[model samples]
Structure formats: C-alpha cells, structure tokens
Target chain A: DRINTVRGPITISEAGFTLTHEHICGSSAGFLRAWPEFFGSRAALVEKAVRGLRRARAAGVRTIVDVSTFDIGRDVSLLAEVSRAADVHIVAATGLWEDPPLSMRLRSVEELTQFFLREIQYGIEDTGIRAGIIKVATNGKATPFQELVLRAAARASLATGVPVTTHTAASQRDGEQQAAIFESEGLSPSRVCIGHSDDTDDLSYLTALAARGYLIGLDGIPHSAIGLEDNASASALLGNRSWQTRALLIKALIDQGYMKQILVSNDWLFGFSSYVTNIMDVMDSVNPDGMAFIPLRVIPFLREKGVSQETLAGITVTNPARFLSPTLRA
Target chain B: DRINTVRGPITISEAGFTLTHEHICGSSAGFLRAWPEFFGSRAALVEKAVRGLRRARAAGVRTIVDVSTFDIGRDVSLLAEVSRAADVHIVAATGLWEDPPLSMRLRSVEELTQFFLREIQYGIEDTGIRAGIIKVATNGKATPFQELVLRAAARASLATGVPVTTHTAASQRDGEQQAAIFESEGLSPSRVCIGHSDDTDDLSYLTALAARGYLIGLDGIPHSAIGLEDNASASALLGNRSWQTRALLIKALIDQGYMKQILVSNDWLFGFSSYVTNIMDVMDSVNPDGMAFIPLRVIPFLREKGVSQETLAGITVTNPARFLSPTLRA
Candidate 1:
C-alpha cells in the first residue's frame, strides 16, 4: 500500500502501472567520482531522466523504481527532481550495487542491518526521500560478503517493512542462493522478488524460486533490437538470452498459473546525459532501450501471443505492487 | 609493539626479516564455495603454503604476513596449520579482496568496521587465531566501494589499532587514492602501507607516498625471471618492470633517506599446488621467480649496486617489523 516517490511516500493505488526494476544511470562508479565531468551535471542527468520518464508516462506508465544503489551512482537528489519534473513516481533503492570495496565486504550483517534501517526509516542523502525498497545484489556467488548483505537487507526489510528486490546473475541460477540467504534470516519468501529470472530460460530454476514463495522478475524483457554484443541471446552475436525467448517463457509460466508471481521490468542502466552521442553511435555495440520499449513493444508482443490483458496487468501492475509493497511478515 | 601470529602474540623484536605480504592460496572464491574439489583439499592448500613459507624461512625469513582475505579463499585454519608446520610466524589478514560479490559491496563502511573489528579483537572462525593486520584493496578507482573499504580499514584500525595494508592497482598509481581515504578518516599515513609501488618506474609517485609518511610496499620486489607479461620493464615480453630497475629504485629511495619507509615482499597469489602444472608451465611463459627471488636476487642485486647492509636491514627486517607492529595511533 506504500511507495517511495523521490519526494516522499505515496499510496500504492496512485502508483498505477509500474516498472519494478530499472536504472536511470549505471556507470563505472570510479569514473563518476574521480572525474565529475563523466556524469555531466545533476541538472543534465535529471533532464535526461525526465525525458525518458515522460515518454513512459505519456504511454500511461505511472512509476519506475530506479534501483541504482549508492555504489553505482544512485544520485537520490537527481532522482527526486526527475520524478517531479517528469510527473512520474520514482522509487529510489536504499541498498548497494556490486564489486564493493574490501571494507564493506568485511562488515558484519548486524551493523549493515542498522545502517540500512536508517535509510529505510529516514531518507537517502539530505532529501528526506525514503528509499522505497532495499536492493541486494551478488555476482552469482555465495560468498560470506554476499550472505551478509542478503541477510542485512532482509533484516532491514523486517525492521522497516520495506520489500526487498535483487539484481542476481542468472548465469549460476543465483536466485536459489539469494532465496537461501533470505530464508535463513527468517524473512518471508513472499516479501522478496528474485530478479533477472528472465535472463535464463532455466525452467526448473524459475519454478524453484517461485516454489519458495518469492516473486520472479522478468526484468530484461525484449532485447530484440539491441545488437548482438549487448543483447544476451543465443544467436552468438550480441549475447545468449533474448526478450522474445523471455516472452515465450513468461507465456508458459503465465499458463502455469504464475501470472501473479511474475513482475516485468526493463533493466535500463545507461548514462543519459554523459553518453548522449555514444548511445547513438554505439547503438551498434551496446544499447539501453528507451522508456518506450516496455509498454510499447513487450506488452503488445505478449498480448499478440495470447497473454491476456489482465495477466499483463498482474506482471506490470499487481505483482510489482505486491512485491514492492512494504508489507511485513508479522 | 606486538603482532598476532597463529601461535600467539609476538613482540616486534621477534618479527625479523619478514616477508610482509604473500598468499599461500588464491583460489576462485566462487568455485571454493560451490565445489570444494576445484581448490583441492584444505590439506592440499596448507601444504602448499607450508612449503612456500618454509622456503622463505629457509632463506632466513622469520615471518610472513599472509594477506589473503575472505573473498580470496583465505583459510585461517589451514593457514594456522601452515605457520606451525613451516615453523614460521604467519600473520593472516582480516578483510575482503577486490571485486567481492555485489552483496558485500552494497554494505556500508561503518557497518564493515564492526565486522572486521571482531577478526582483529577475538579471532577468525573460532580458530582463536586472530588476524594480525587489516587488508584493504581497490581496483585503484576512487569509487564508493573502494573508498568504503579504505575508510572501513581505517575505522577498524582506529578501533583496534591494527595497522592496515592494501592490494592496489599500481598501474594507475592507485595507492594515492587509498592514502587519501585513510587520511580523510584521520588515520596517520605512517599506519598504512601502500602496496605494489614497484609496478611502475614512477619514482616521483613512490617518493610522494613516502613524503606523506606512508610505508611504500615494494611488494612486487624483483620480478627477476618473469616474462614480459608479468614484468613491468619497458623492454617487455612477459613483464614491464625488472629487478634491475626495482633495485635501482630501492637504492635511490634508501639514498633519499626513506629507508624505514619501505617494506618488501613477493606477492605470491597463485596456488603452487592448486594450479601446479599451470604454475610450472606458466613459470616458463612468465617466470616470476619463486619465493627465493627477493633474498637471492633483489637483495644481492641491491648490495652489488652499492646499497648498504643497514639499508637491507630496514627493508627486510627492521621496516617490516615496524610496519606490522600494532602500535596504535595515539
């Protein structure tokens, strides 16, 4: 029943249709820090975000949860401004991204629990905009650091009643490991949504996570237009997995009565203001789809293949709402 | 004035001619977690470290600070056995290595301080063998994760007064970034050692670190027989640097009155047993002379180049003993 807009919290009913997992900007955190020139200005980044968000909003999309954590350039202030300018709800994540420095990895989970609690209960930066969700990610490994973060995220979620989402590498079917860590923390599996489930067509893997009572995020929907290098599909040119294939699998899962358990998002994480020309020039090399892609292409394609409107609403609406809602396990 | 060996605390007087940094095993943390078979047995790892340490000890090396952190398959229990078996004082590190899984990277540095404090205070993994030093590493970028690790290491050092060391990408001269973070946390530069300084011919860089009162780790020591790929010499095939240049630089630093500010060690990361055939064959492809290099080659090379016996004492014995001594910053 709650959502974190960059400005503040809002009613879930006001969220309308939402994109659960996406990034407004994801760049090498080092470049951004050492060279402020790399990210352009906060104004420039916000303007770019507003352009993209307004496009999605024009197509009737109400919200986007920008899950770029503090490590990988979250820019909470910019996000708040973007949400207001674009007139769209933007949920900022209160968690971290991967390849953390040695110090963070060395920390205890209980300390992390307290640290994340402040962010969830209070706000990110000085903005007074509370983080809508806790993002936990891993490099498809079950290292102690990863375990600490997962458990910490779960603990924070339990304390704040904020739902948890993740950015998991699908290569190892890491969702299983993520679930195991959360479960050990005594968190309700239903309060978690295992992300990047669509990146692999491991039938058994998706079913396994679903059986654990966690929602599955088919976030990388429709990478059909991206070049072979950036597109992780089986054609051996861009990548290994494809969105068309993702849609087919989602269809099968929807038929499997998992419509309520699936959430859809496009993992857009390219710098908009900084790499303006490169995004066009290297559109041949790597491509981060515009906001128009999800509501414009993925849903229409899924509908064409006999995915009912109600089910699409569940993935695009009901499931994300359920997955993101700060409903605690009493 | 004391350091934690697997056996017990020992005075700086007992820690003589120490190899300040080396790893007995550096297996993929992922494989080690998912399949123990890949890294061979813990017994196998212990044997390799014992052999390496015994070789160094035979070369009159009294101690080794094994800086293998948690993410890099640090087996404190195995390392403990190695120290006793090799009859050498082995100081293990309490930290995570670089590119730790996303879970750890997402955590806060404040939280990590408490996490690493335990390893410094109590012991690692119920072994009653506490880590003697804190290891902090970065990809040489001034990113949040890297900064977090550097700051966290500083915080832990403040809490326990355990001196901090690091694994830095010397190619970019990243040691300065590490120093900056520690300095920001109000840690004395003398309490830190910036590692991998010999990777470049940038004398100014090493001197600059020394000028800041920081100990510079000539940890690469003399890459005597390494092919251009492993050497840092300009006339490169297996490496880009050479022992000749390294000795010349060390001699220059000593002449410049920075004798006690330099610590030397061979950064032994690859497992001699785990990757036996590869280590043997690659030694031919890129032979970075074994544990025997520094004492047999570099020291002799420096001596012949008119470096005094007193300077050698500082680099090999006095300096390392001083650096590893947990003399808290008052």
Candidate 2:
C-alpha cells in the first residue's frame, strides 16, 4: 500500500522507523504564520528542523508523522522543504488540535469534515501537498468544539481510509471516549492511534484500547526530565511520569503480546512560539541525540528489560507503517 | 500637562471624551504581525478600526486609551494610521499583559523593567510611538511570573511618571492585592486604574479601590449580552453580569461621590485572532453604535438615574486625561 508524504505517495515499507506522533512546530492557532519570529524566524526554524530530522534519519528514522495540525501552525511548505533537505519523509496532518479558532468552532461538523477532507484529498492551502494523516485532540472534558472536531476527524478518516491519530489527556483517561466516538462513526479500531497514552501509567487504560485493536502511541518517551526540573513549571503542571515509567509501560505492553499495537516516538517538538528560545538550542543542551532520543536512550532501556530487537522493529516501523497506510481512497 | 498618543503628545484638554481600557486590535502576541489574515488582513483591519473609531468620535469619544499591551498584539503603527484617518487620539500602553511569552518570563525583573521603560520612553518596536500608560494584569493568586511583570510595570511607571492601569479578576478582589503591590512600590493610587471592576457587583470591593483614589474601570458595558446567549458558549464560560447591574454600579459609585474615579468604556475590540469573525461585522449586527455603546446605551441609563452631564463628562473625559497624563520622567 502507498502512503501520503509531503513529497507525495510512498510505499508502506518506505515509512520505516517513523516517529508516529511529533510536532516540528507549534503555536496558538495562527500565531506561527503571523509571527514566525516567535519561533526564531521561518528560515532559522526550517534549518533547525532540517538538522534535527537529518539526525533522526542518521539514527534510522525514515519518516516522521508531524501531527501539527492547522491550528498549531502546520506549514506544509516548510515540512516539504525540511523533508527534502533532511531526506526524511514528513507526513503532515489534516485535523485540528485542542483549542481551535472560533471561526472553525462556528463551522458545522460537515463543514469541518469537508475542511479536513480538502486538506487530505486536494491539498493544504493550495500547496498540493496532501496531508498523510488525521489529527484530533482533547484535554479534560471534550468541549462541544472538540467533540465536533473529533467527529469530523472520524468522518474524514473513514471517507479517505487514512489513518487517524489523537492527542489525549491521558491523565483524564479520555482516550476511551475518543475511541468510542471513532467506533461510533464506524471507523476501524486498527486504523486509529491514541496518542500521548504514555503520559498515564494506567496499564488498564492503555491495554484496554490496544485489546480493541487500537495503536498505543508511547510518544512521551523523550520528554524524560520534562516536568522534573524546578525551572520547568509549565512542564511540571503537565504531570511528571519519568522516562523509566514510560519504558516499563512499553515493556509490559510487549510482554502482553501487543507489540504490533505499540507505536514508539519521541514526541520531539522543534519549537513553540516565544518559548524555550528555539528548541534546537535546548535540545542540543538537554538531549544531544534530539529526535534520536527514542532509538538511543529508550531502545537501550527496553533492550535491557528484555525487549527483543524484532519487537522494537515492530513498534518503530511495522506498526506505524501499517497504521499509516491507507486502506481506501475518496 | 500633555499625554502621549499615537499621534504624539497632545494637550490634556484635547483628550476629551476618552474611553479608557479599550482595544483597537487584539491577538496572541506576534500573531497580528505574522498573520494579519487571521484578523481579516492588515489593511481591512485598519479600515474597520478607523470606521469604528470615527463612529465613536462622532458619538463624542475624542480619545481611546488602548490597554492592549504587547502580548495582546498591540500595533502602534496601525493605531497611528487609524488615528489619522478616524480623527481620534489613540493612547497606546507600555507593559506586558497576562501570560507573557516565556522569553520575557525568563528575564530578571530589572530586565523587564528596562523593557517597559523603553516602550514608554523610547517607543514600541521602533515605531517612535511612546505609550501614554503602563498596563499590568492579575487573575487569581498572582504567580511569581505575573508578580515579576507587575513589579516591572510599577518600576516603569515610577521611573517615567506614567499612569498605571490594570486588568483584575474583580470577583477575586485581586485589585486590592494589585493596589497593595503598587503602594509598596510607592506608586500613588491616583495614578492607577483598576479595570473590569464592573464585572462584579461587589460594591465593597469597588469602593475600596476607588476610595484608595484608584480609577475603577467599568469597561465591560458594551459586552452586555456577551456571556448570556446560548450560542456564545465561549463568552458563557466567563461569568455573566447584566448591563443593568453594571450601570447601577456606576450610579452607586456616583452616589457615593466616586464619579471622578469611574472610567466608562466598551472595551471595544476591533479583532482577535480568528475569533468573533471580525468584530466589525458582528457590531453591525448586534450593537449598531459599535464603540459608542457606552455613550449611546449606558450614559442614557445613568442620566435617567439622576447622573448629570458634567459627571458623565468627568468620567469620559477628565478622569482618563488626568490619569493618563504622565507626571515624572527619568
């Protein structure tokens, strides 16, 4: 099966060692497009992403599923440029993140569904760069706005047969509700990946979704010291579950024979508007490996805990490839 | 005495019928600069703002103190352009709003003080547009970061002799805490205006701040049906206090002889990032008078309740001019 990339369609096998859930950039809705300087200017940001993606490619990452949606200032042109330079596939997303602009919120579900479909089928913003995947998000209670986007995401996924991934408030255990909505829309569970599931240690919650054929995105692996520092108040407020817990979560999921349902990623973010003074500088300081944090750090820990190489290959490659590969087309 | 406006220094007598605590434009900091499309294009936004300001000017508003600080995407050049077109003075503010960028938050309080001073004394972003006032904000319990901005605002005001204005969670009665901080910094209460005081009907709280010689911003008047509608769930989340209550608060304050300490305004917003679908079109739909809502609706109500034109003139003209006129320079 062929999969969509910023560079166009690729064979499923070409989507090797994919970081299934990560953002190259983020901002408050339209902030990035309006304020490129907030992320250290568009050119500097692209160069930084190129370097990170190049490092990832060298570390055996062939593709990155950038789940930065329109709301997060997902720039398809920038992603395509970075992908071309870094020689890594970038699968742009066609969906909305947590809080959308009121203009989008005022749209009907059908309108939103059409919006997502247009991005996936035609292109995002006349670039002719079709998004490869669908992204939807919810935190705490799913507001009417979020539920609308979720339903629209499901509809877009079902119609296009493109895979769907989500950002969930794992602490609230809201992934179940997301899955329920997807299933209610008649989408196959196997085609859906519940992301940020690693943020919560509730094995029951992760396994329950996996047992129903959903992909488990342990995307928070590289955010090891994220919330632990005294200075990291923003991350601290997000709750601190160490990398060890996330690694153990992966190990247990594999021991339970759900390796095929596991998708491992760093959730590596390149930059957010006016935060961290450009993430690349901090990435170089904190984790020298950058996007290679998963393969370098987490994989070593998993191997120590008896995670077989085949299993690692499955989560990092096979699972993401299968999940990303479209089953049908509009 | 003269007050700084986007058009340069104007005699205090020329600052007639001023609307305190209004925004000509608003956005997530840097969004307006990068994504003017979100606000319906830079030219269109300026035109719409000019039209609104002209209508307000015709309705007796000679000046508007735009409290949209740097974080809210304050555009001084645009304000100057609009001022020229609309024949109304635009008094810009110097200070950070709530939730400043992380880059600013990382700076020492002294560093932040210099930044605000630069905006006040020099100009905001090389526009040669000096701010007439310093605006600071506090929600619930002031975080260390917020306290840093607050202290910086105080230092800038104390150094430049510019007046200080505030956004307060009036329900939390945090204006008192804000006053306390300013007092500790040795800023005279008369130089400060506690905004959104009308959001709560807490007479004791309003009187306490006003009695301390702080101007009370009854800025939420035009937002009468703002949070009451079933469709406006976004506004609904913010507590709904009726317009009658707000007008009565103004009446009660006047009866209590704090009329000179009361500042009336619409908190007229020209646009926010992708919200309310360009406020001008909605203004044409809901409130026909636009920024003239306070004069057209609320003033008539107060006049019926025994408030004389002189009292109205004092609140709308004298109070803002006097408070905004800076007293000291470094």
Candidate 3:
C-alpha cells in the first residue's frame, strides 16, 4: 500500500516509505481570523483535528511532522494525543511564526537558539513531550527579521544536533535566506529543510538552495494560501494550467539534479477547507485536491514530456526519505 | 450645474460633474471570455446595464461617457437607449481596442481612421447610429501595435475635429506610451486623455505625460485592479501597513504637478458587472456604502496624504470634460 501523511493514522500496509512533513491539525492564524464565523470556536478546531488525524491514518501516512510554529497556535498536548491515537510517529516543533502578533517582538537569536535547543534535547525539558524537529519561519520577503529568525533556528539546530526546518515565505527568497543563515551559523545545510519553497515562479532559487545542501519543501499543494490558487481558481482571468504550469517549474527544479534534496507534504490547514471544497465543486475548476495525483499525474505528464520514472521515484520517495530520516546525520 | 454626454442625450445637474469613461452596455469581449458564465447572455447584460444606470443616477452621477471600444462590445444603439432612459449624457465611442484579435490583424491606419470618421460624421453613417466621441486604446505596454492604434485614432480625431481619448494598459508603461504616441501622431496632446494612468507606481510617468499635455485617467479608484489590493490584504496577514501603503503612489503622482491631467470615472460596465461588483462588495465590507462618502472617503484619503484639490478636480471633472467635449476640439 501507499502512505500519505495528509490523510493521517499510520498505515504500514507494505508501504515502502513514510512522509516526514504533514499537518494533522490547525492552520495559519490568518485562516482562523478570515473565517472566524465558520471556524472560530475551540470546539470546531478540536473536532477538525480529531477528524483530520483519523483521515491521515487511513490514508497510510506512517510518520509525519506538524510544523505549525509557536504563536501560530501549536498545541503539544494535542499533537501527543493525535500521535498516540493514530499510532503514527508525530513530530512536533518549537519555532516562531512569520506573521504578527508573533513575528513582532520575537526573542533575540540567542534566546531562540536556547529555546529550540532545550525543546529538542530534553523533550520540552520537563513535559515528557518530544519535538522531533526545530521549526522557524521567514516571511518569504527576505527581510532583516526573517534573517534573524533563520539565524536563530540554524544556531539552535547546531546546538541540539537536531534537524531544523523553516516556514519560508511564498517565494524562493526564503530558501536563499535559509541557505545564508545555515552557512553563517556554520551549521550543516543538509540538516535544514526549507519549507514552502514551491510557492515561487523562480526555479533557480530552489535549485541553488539545493546545491547548498538544503532540502526543498514542496508541501502546501492544492491550497490557495500562497496566491497560486488566485491563478488556479480563475485561470481564464489568470491563465489555464497556471497551477499545473507552476508545478511544472518545481518538476523542472527536480530534473535539474535537485530531486535528491526535495521533500513533499500537504500543509493542509483546517480553515482553508472552503477554498479546497470550492475548487472541487466546480466542474471545470482545477481541483487543488488533484494535487495528490502530482506524482501520478505530474510524473506521467513529465514522463510523456520526457522525464524518467527513476527521477520521479527520487522525488516521491528516495529524496524525501533521505532528507527526513534521522540517519542522514549519522 | 454639471453637464455630461450620454449615448445620444445630454444631462445637466447641479450636484456633481460628469463621468467620461463609463460602461453602459455590451461585454468587454476579453473580460467576458475570462468570465463567460457570468456575461454570456445579452438579455442578462442589458438588465444589468439598466440597473447600473439607475444606480449611477442615484449616486448623483449626472452624465457619463460610454467609452466601450469595438472589441469590448460597444453597442451604440443600446447605449443611446440607456442614455435616454437614464436621462444621463452618454457619450458613445468609435475606436479600436489595444490587444490581440483586434490589433493583431488591423486594417491600414487610414482605413481605421475612416471608420472613426464615419461614426462621427454620419452618426454610424451607413449603419444609421450615432457615436459621440473618438476612442482609442493602447496596451499600456510600449508596443508597435498600440502605436499604430494611437496614430490611427489621432488621425481620425484631427481629420474629423473630434476629441480623442485612450484606454491605456494599467501600468507605468502606459503613461510613457501615451506621451510617445500623442507626440508621434502630431495630435495636440491637450486633446488626448490617457486612461488608467493611476495604475503606475512611479510619479514621473504621470508627470511626464501631463507635462506633454495629455490628460491622465485616474479613473479606477478604490479598486485594486492594478496590484494595489495586495497592501490591505497583505496587511491583514503581516499586521503592517507596508503592503497597503504602496497604493499611495497614485496620490503622490497627483501631488507632483500632474493633478490637472487627472480624470476620474467608474469605468463601470453592466455586462462586466463582476469587476464592479467585486470592488463594490470589498468597499461595502470595509466601509458602508452611501454612509461612506466618495470624495470625502476617497478624495481626502488621497489629498491629506498629499494629493492636491486641483489634481482632484482635474481627475473629477476638468480633464474628463476637456477630453470628452466635442466643443473643446474646435
């Protein structure tokens, strides 16, 4: 059987591998604010998380990481419960979110490094909860603040000998910043996964980051969070196959000898369900959910257009596994 | 009293000035193609136009110029009817659109000139309808095709002694192209109105166009049609005004001695209701309609931040009147 982290509990049905980055519960704080009327209360959030975990398990997702950072509403307790109930290895995180009131007034780089080191080394020090990875975010714009956050996350990773991942802004700029921070902190770039690297028109940025030994995150597919849906939902007003066309860019990046540095996940947040549902409802709409078929559809599309199955496998399995496996450092 | 031209009639009112670049009937073919399901039927189109006219009258809009070009579905007959029913001056148009299918395989400049001449001289002459003003379009981008269309329109205006106006693409490139086209065509720049000049971020382009004596169409206000909406929307995410603050560039252009060249209009089209509806909905959601004044809510927002009243009036009335008035040409 196949494993998909997005659908939830761990299913070990002769599945060859497991996805490392996936969300079982929650989403961006902006999503909550935008749809407060629909998903406002705590009850709605908890119910959605519970339902999401069950779906994830049945879908064969064995081990996954919920990378929603601090102030983005990370719940260690909820993550623990989901991990235990779903019978999957759920990796939690400790990092700052990119937007305010979180992005503002963040602790100094040293303080952040200490915080992340403590969480990773001592299992939240006293809570008996483990954070498998260290997470931090940068607004894809490459601002000074984002640099500081990346520096801190890199420092923390070095201190704890834990793999660090970053929530990159909706463009390739974040990947560049992550690379710079990793190098400056004298940390192993291979230990850092650059998240949201797919939300850009520039492929060179991802390839360049990959060249630096950083892993590129191609998660958040089938979601409109990154303005990709703006063009996807109304391709006529935007352009047809725009979403697929953008995905092709990512495929091209993989083709350019960087597939070995790639990882995939579904940054599925509960609040963006409407956008997903709306896309699915329309007959002509490019179903964002069809993103699952990326390996099935895009790989074939690339193959027909001349990419090889071996390359596709590297992107879908080998590369992701190598990047996420704790054995990478050893 | 305010005086404005409708399709065939003229309306004079005491409250406010006129709107020159307004849409009464017919589909902007490209816009319709982008949203075929919404603007596909003609009956639905006419009904929407009637409703829009009623709304305009209620909003104290005394007169309007229906400047829909040929490809944008300029229906002179229907515009005339709407003008009569609404009792608003509805100046009709005769010109070519700037983009493909229209400009790609255009006739000789003289032939195009004759078409506008016929519309003005014989009131759609052989076809038996009236066209009030000379209309022209440019793809805001500095393209050879746009230069040709502008030259043809300018020639038609000079030959027929009819005033000319242009539909500029929404970008800084439009202002530069407008000036170049007007200068190249040997048309008195004062007789020309460049549409969508507000779309540019640079004040130099607008100032340069204004200095050349071309009226700048700052028509689409409060609408993020040209990349301005990112600020407010981005602010909601980042909790900072930096994104939304970029829109102030328009007001800055007005302050730089380019105000007299500015002209304002709703650019409202019934068949193209989605554009107007979406913007209106956004405005309504953010600020209540009617209770929220236009010049008060919008004008001061521009002025207090730097736009001058002279520039405001130029956009509100003076430039539009000069460009639309047949008497002004003589």
lDDT of each prediction vs. the true structure?
0.71, 0.79, 0.55
lDDT of 3 at B94: 75
DockQ of 2: 0.12
Candidate 1 lDDT over A158-259, as tens digits, reads 887788888887768899889988988889988888887787878889988887688888887754443444432323322345668876777878877778
Better of 1 and 3 by TM-score: 1
Cα lDDT of model 2 by residue, A1-330, tens digit: 788899999998888898998888765543444345555567888888899888888888899999988667677788899999999999999888864644566667887887888888987765788888999999977888888888998899888889888999898988999988888888888888899998998988988898898888888775655634664644543345677887788998988888888888878777765344444455445567778898878888989888889888878888888888887421
lDDT per residue as tens, model 1, B164-249: 88877777889888888888998988889888777777888889899989988878664445444433332331244566776577
Quote the positional error of residue A240 for candidate 3 in Å.
Answer: 38
User: What is candidate 1's CA lDDT for residue B306?
Assistant: 91
Q: Give per-residue lDDT, candidate 2, residue B70.
A: 68
By lDDT rank, best first, the candidates go 2, 1, 3
Report residue A303 deviation for candidate 3 (angstroms).
Answer: 52
DockQ of each: 0.05, 0.12, 0.01
True contacts kept of each: 0.06, 0.12, 0.00
